[PDB]
Design a protein around this ligand. Structure first.
Ligand SMILES: [Rh+3]
Ligand SMILES: [Rh+3]
Length: 124
């Protein structure tokens, strides 16, 4: 199938740019990542750092995951991210998102060989 590591890159990595340029960013990117195919995915974070810089988080601050597992890591640095949240009036198939750009620490669950992010837990 799609691997856990590949699903993380599909839902959460957007190295392309250093930040979302425009208010249409989430509408465009949620569609492009298949997150509007069968339903509007309500909440999603994109990280605008290199894959290497995000994979490096798996060697930074070890923390508990929301689910109680201990394979979560917090980035020592802040990272350029975009929070995508579906609007209250958004109706599939016309999925509508508010774009919010921020610099925040990310928290990711890491697994496998190579040891890489497989889940986005939170930003802080
Ligand atoms: Rh997950
Ligand atoms: Rh999952």
């Amino acid at each position: 199938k799609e691997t856990a590591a590949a699903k993380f890159e599909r839902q959460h990595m957007d190295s392309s740019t250093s930040a979302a340029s425009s208010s249409n960013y989430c509408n465009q990117m949620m569609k492009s990542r298949n997150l509007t195919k069968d339903r509007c995915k309500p909440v999603n974070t994109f990280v605008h750092e290199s894959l290497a810089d995000v994979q490096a988080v798996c060697s930074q601050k070890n923390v508990a995951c929301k689910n109680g597992q201990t394979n979560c890591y917090q980035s020592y640095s802040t990272m350029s991210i975009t929070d995508c949240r579906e609007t209250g009036s958004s109706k599939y198939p016309n999925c509508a998102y508010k774009t919010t750009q921020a610099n925040k620490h990310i928290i990711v669950a890491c697994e496998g060989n190579p040891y890489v992010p497989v889940h986005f837990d939170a930003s802080v």
